[PDB]
Amino acid sequence: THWGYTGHDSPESWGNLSEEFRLCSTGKNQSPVNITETVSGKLPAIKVNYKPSMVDVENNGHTIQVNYPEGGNTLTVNGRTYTLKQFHFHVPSENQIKGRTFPMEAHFVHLDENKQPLVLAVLYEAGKTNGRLSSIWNVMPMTAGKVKLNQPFDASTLLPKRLKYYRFAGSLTTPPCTEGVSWLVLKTYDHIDQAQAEKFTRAVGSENNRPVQPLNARVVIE
Numbered sequence: 001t002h003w004g005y006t007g008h009d010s011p012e013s014w015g016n017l018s019e020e021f022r023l024c025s026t027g028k029n030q031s032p033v034n035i036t037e038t039v040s041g042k043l044p045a046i047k048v049n050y051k052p053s054m055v056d057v058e059n060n061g062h063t064i065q066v067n068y069p070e071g072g073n074t075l076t077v078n079g080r081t082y083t084l085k086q087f088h089f090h091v092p093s094e095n096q097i098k099g100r101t102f103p104m105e106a107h108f109v110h111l112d113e114n115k116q117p118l119v120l121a122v123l124y125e126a127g128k129t130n131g132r133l134s135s136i137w138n139v140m141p142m143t144a145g146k147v148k149l150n151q152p153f154d155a156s157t158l159l160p161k162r163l164k165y166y167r168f169a170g171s172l173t174t175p176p177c178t179e180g181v182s183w184l185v186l187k188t189y190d191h192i193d194q195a196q197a198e199k200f201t202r203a204v205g206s207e208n209n210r211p212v213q214p215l216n217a218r219v220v221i222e
Protein backbone atom coordinates (compact mmCIF):
# COMPACT_ATOMS: atom_id res chain seq x y z
CA THR A 1 0.00 0.00 0.00
CA HIS A 2 1.13 3.54 -0.76
CA TRP A 3 3.03 5.53 1.85
CA GLY A 4 5.27 8.60 1.78
CA TYR A 5 6.64 11.49 3.90
CA THR A 6 4.02 14.14 2.98
CA GLY A 7 0.43 14.38 1.72
CA HIS A 8 -2.35 12.63 3.69
CA ASP A 9 0.07 9.70 3.62
CA SER A 10 2.68 10.92 6.04
CA PRO A 11 4.63 9.12 8.81
CA GLU A 12 2.10 10.06 11.53
CA SER A 13 -0.68 8.14 9.74
CA TRP A 14 1.33 5.05 8.59
CA GLY A 15 -0.29 2.83 11.27
CA ASN A 16 -3.86 3.32 9.90
CA LEU A 17 -2.92 2.66 6.22
CA SER A 18 -3.32 -1.08 6.88
CA GLU A 19 -3.53 -3.52 9.82
CA GLU A 20 -0.08 -4.83 8.82
CA PHE A 21 1.72 -1.44 9.28
CA ARG A 22 0.14 -1.01 12.74
CA LEU A 23 3.47 -1.35 14.63
CA CYS A 24 4.40 2.01 13.10
CA SER A 25 1.93 3.65 15.49
CA THR A 26 1.70 1.12 18.36
CA GLY A 27 5.34 -0.01 18.79
CA LYS A 28 7.38 1.07 21.84
CA ASN A 29 10.83 0.33 20.27
CA GLN A 30 10.70 2.43 17.10
CA SER A 31 13.42 4.09 15.03
CA PRO A 32 14.63 6.70 14.34
CA VAL A 33 15.62 8.36 17.69
CA ASN A 34 17.18 11.57 19.13
CA ILE A 35 20.25 10.32 21.05
CA THR A 36 20.39 12.58 24.14
CA GLU A 37 21.14 10.63 27.34
CA THR A 38 23.43 7.65 27.07
CA VAL A 39 25.25 5.09 29.19
CA SER A 40 29.01 4.84 28.72
CA GLY A 41 29.72 1.14 28.28
CA LYS A 42 32.22 -1.28 26.79
CA LEU A 43 30.71 -2.03 23.37
CA PRO A 44 32.25 -4.88 21.27
CA ALA A 45 34.43 -3.51 18.48
CA ILE A 46 33.13 -3.61 14.86
CA LYS A 47 35.20 -5.44 12.21
CA VAL A 48 34.33 -4.38 8.64
CA ASN A 49 34.82 -7.08 5.97
CA TYR A 50 33.47 -4.96 3.12
CA LYS A 51 35.05 -5.36 -0.35
CA PRO A 52 34.09 -4.48 -4.01
CA SER A 53 30.98 -6.09 -5.62
CA MET A 54 28.68 -5.83 -8.62
CA VAL A 55 25.81 -3.71 -7.36
CA ASP A 56 22.75 -2.04 -8.81
CA VAL A 57 21.34 1.34 -7.83
CA GLU A 58 17.58 1.35 -7.31
CA ASN A 59 15.08 4.17 -6.88
CA ASN A 60 12.14 2.47 -5.11
CA GLY A 61 10.19 5.77 -4.81
CA HIS A 62 11.25 6.38 -1.17
CA THR A 63 15.09 6.26 -1.29
CA ILE A 64 18.19 5.67 -3.38
CA GLN A 65 19.51 2.19 -2.54
CA VAL A 66 22.45 -0.04 -3.60
CA ASN A 67 21.51 -3.73 -3.78
CA TYR A 68 24.13 -6.40 -3.13
CA PRO A 69 22.93 -9.57 -5.06
CA GLU A 70 25.59 -11.68 -3.24
CA GLY A 71 26.71 -11.94 0.41
CA GLY A 72 30.36 -10.92 -0.02
CA ASN A 73 30.35 -7.90 2.31
CA THR A 74 30.07 -8.64 6.01
CA LEU A 75 30.27 -7.12 9.45
CA THR A 76 31.43 -9.06 12.52
CA VAL A 77 30.15 -7.70 15.84
CA ASN A 78 30.52 -9.70 19.06
CA GLY A 79 31.48 -12.95 17.32
CA ARG A 80 28.42 -12.62 15.02
CA THR A 81 28.76 -12.21 11.25
CA TYR A 82 26.16 -10.02 9.45
CA THR A 83 25.74 -9.99 5.63
CA LEU A 84 25.28 -6.60 3.95
CA LYS A 85 22.08 -6.80 1.84
CA GLN A 86 21.81 -3.21 0.67
CA PHE A 87 22.56 0.36 1.74
CA HIS A 88 20.46 3.45 1.25
CA PHE A 89 20.03 7.04 2.12
CA HIS A 90 17.92 9.57 4.00
CA VAL A 91 17.92 13.30 3.34
CA PRO A 92 17.92 14.74 5.82
CA SER A 93 18.97 12.40 8.66
CA GLU A 94 16.43 10.29 10.56
CA ASN A 95 18.51 9.79 13.74
CA GLN A 96 19.62 12.95 15.60
CA ILE A 97 22.57 13.70 17.92
CA LYS A 98 21.49 16.03 20.77
CA GLY A 99 18.64 17.52 18.66
CA ARG A 100 21.03 18.01 15.71
CA THR A 101 19.65 16.84 12.36
CA PHE A 102 22.38 16.02 9.80
CA PRO A 103 21.91 16.73 6.05
CA MET A 104 22.16 13.02 5.16
CA GLU A 105 22.22 9.58 6.78
CA ALA A 106 23.26 6.25 5.17
CA HIS A 107 21.71 2.93 6.38
CA PHE A 108 23.73 -0.25 5.83
CA VAL A 109 21.26 -3.09 6.39
CA HIS A 110 22.33 -6.67 7.27
CA LEU A 111 21.10 -10.09 8.35
CA ASP A 112 23.08 -12.76 10.29
CA GLU A 113 22.54 -16.49 9.77
CA ASN A 114 19.59 -16.31 12.25
CA LYS A 115 18.08 -13.64 9.94
CA GLN A 116 18.45 -11.05 12.76
CA PRO A 117 18.59 -7.50 11.27
CA LEU A 118 21.42 -5.07 12.03
CA VAL A 119 21.61 -1.49 10.72
CA LEU A 120 24.97 0.31 10.72
CA ALA A 121 24.50 4.04 10.21
CA VAL A 122 26.75 6.81 8.87
CA LEU A 123 25.89 10.49 9.42
CA TYR A 124 27.14 13.12 6.93
CA GLU A 125 28.10 16.66 7.87
CA ALA A 126 27.89 19.44 5.26
CA GLY A 127 31.31 19.85 3.65
CA LYS A 128 33.17 19.11 0.41
CA THR A 129 31.88 16.88 -2.37
CA ASN A 130 31.86 13.21 -1.32
CA GLY A 131 34.18 11.74 -3.96
CA ARG A 132 33.47 8.14 -2.83
CA LEU A 133 29.72 8.49 -3.48
CA SER A 134 30.06 10.26 -6.86
CA SER A 135 30.02 6.85 -8.58
CA ILE A 136 26.51 6.11 -7.18
CA TRP A 137 25.22 9.73 -7.55
CA ASN A 138 26.22 9.73 -11.24
CA VAL A 139 23.86 6.83 -12.17
CA MET A 140 21.13 7.72 -9.68
CA PRO A 141 17.80 6.86 -11.37
CA MET A 142 15.79 10.09 -11.04
CA THR A 143 12.59 8.15 -11.32
CA ALA A 144 11.65 4.74 -9.93
CA GLY A 145 13.78 2.14 -11.73
CA LYS A 146 17.01 0.17 -11.47
CA VAL A 147 20.47 0.15 -13.16
CA LYS A 148 23.30 -2.35 -12.66
CA LEU A 149 26.59 -0.44 -12.38
CA ASN A 150 29.37 -1.47 -14.82
CA GLN A 151 32.37 -0.71 -12.58
CA PRO A 152 32.61 -2.64 -9.26
CA PHE A 153 31.59 -0.72 -6.13
CA ASP A 154 33.61 -0.82 -2.94
CA ALA A 155 31.68 0.05 0.22
CA SER A 156 34.82 0.03 2.44
CA THR A 157 35.35 3.63 1.29
CA LEU A 158 31.97 4.68 2.84
CA LEU A 159 32.95 3.61 6.38
CA PRO A 160 35.57 5.50 8.49
CA LYS A 161 38.54 3.84 10.25
CA ARG A 162 37.26 5.10 13.65
CA LEU A 163 34.37 2.69 14.35
CA LYS A 164 33.00 3.94 17.66
CA TYR A 165 29.19 3.74 17.71
CA TYR A 166 25.97 4.32 19.65
CA ARG A 167 23.99 1.10 20.19
CA PHE A 168 20.27 0.69 20.78
CA ALA A 169 17.50 -1.69 19.78
CA GLY A 170 14.88 -0.41 17.39
CA SER A 171 12.91 -0.86 14.18
CA LEU A 172 12.68 -0.21 10.42
CA THR A 173 11.95 3.50 9.90
CA THR A 174 9.71 2.61 6.95
CA PRO A 175 6.46 0.53 6.98
CA PRO A 176 5.89 -2.12 8.24
CA CYS A 177 8.28 -0.66 10.89
CA THR A 178 9.29 -4.19 12.08
CA GLU A 179 10.97 -4.14 15.53
CA GLY A 180 13.92 -6.28 16.71
CA VAL A 181 16.50 -4.37 14.62
CA SER A 182 19.93 -3.69 16.11
CA TRP A 183 21.05 -0.07 15.57
CA LEU A 184 24.73 0.98 15.49
CA VAL A 185 25.19 4.68 14.75
CA LEU A 186 28.88 5.51 14.09
CA LYS A 187 30.32 8.52 15.89
CA THR A 188 32.72 9.51 13.06
CA TYR A 189 30.99 11.69 10.50
CA ASP A 190 31.47 11.59 6.73
CA HIS A 191 30.59 14.65 4.54
CA ILE A 192 28.40 15.65 1.55
CA ASP A 193 28.24 18.97 -0.32
CA GLN A 194 24.92 20.72 -1.06
CA ALA A 195 24.44 19.61 -4.70
CA GLN A 196 24.61 15.98 -3.66
CA ALA A 197 21.80 16.35 -1.10
CA GLU A 198 19.62 18.40 -3.43
CA LYS A 199 20.04 15.94 -6.32
CA PHE A 200 19.08 13.07 -4.02
CA THR A 201 15.92 14.87 -2.87
CA ARG A 202 15.12 15.70 -6.53
CA ALA A 203 15.54 12.01 -7.43
CA VAL A 204 13.49 10.55 -4.57
CA GLY A 205 10.90 13.35 -4.73
CA SER A 206 10.96 14.43 -1.05
CA GLU A 207 12.89 14.64 2.21
CA ASN A 208 12.66 11.00 3.33
CA ASN A 209 13.19 11.03 7.12
CA ARG A 210 10.73 9.40 9.44
CA PRO A 211 10.50 11.71 12.53
CA VAL A 212 12.20 10.58 15.76
CA GLN A 213 10.20 8.27 18.05
CA PRO A 214 10.40 8.16 21.94
CA LEU A 215 13.07 5.95 23.52
CA ASN A 216 10.49 4.78 26.08
CA ALA A 217 12.26 1.95 28.04
CA ARG A 218 15.40 1.93 25.90
CA VAL A 219 18.96 2.96 26.76
CA VAL A 220 21.48 4.14 24.15
CA ILE A 221 25.03 2.94 24.87
CA GLU A 222 28.00 5.04 23.81
Ligand SMILES: CC(=O)Nc1nnc(S(N)(=O)=O)s1
Pocket residue numbers: 107109119171172173174175
Ligand atom coordinates in the same frame (compact mmCIF):
# COMPACT_ATOMS: atom_id res chain seq x y z
C1 LIG B 1 14.00 -5.28 3.38
C2 LIG B 1 14.45 -4.00 4.10
O1 LIG B 1 15.61 -3.86 4.41
N1 LIG B 1 13.45 -2.96 4.34
C3 LIG B 1 13.77 -1.74 5.05
N2 LIG B 1 12.86 -0.89 5.52
N3 LIG B 1 13.35 0.16 6.25
C4 LIG B 1 14.66 0.17 6.38
S1 LIG B 1 15.64 1.35 7.27
N4 LIG B 1 15.30 2.89 6.68
O2 LIG B 1 15.37 1.24 8.73
O3 LIG B 1 17.08 0.94 7.31
S2 LIG B 1 15.35 -1.19 5.55
Ligand SMILES: [Zn+2]
Pocket residue numbers: 088089090107173
Ligand atom coordinates in the same frame (compact mmCIF):
# COMPACT_ATOMS: atom_id res chain seq x y z
ZN1 LIG C 1 16.91 3.70 6.21
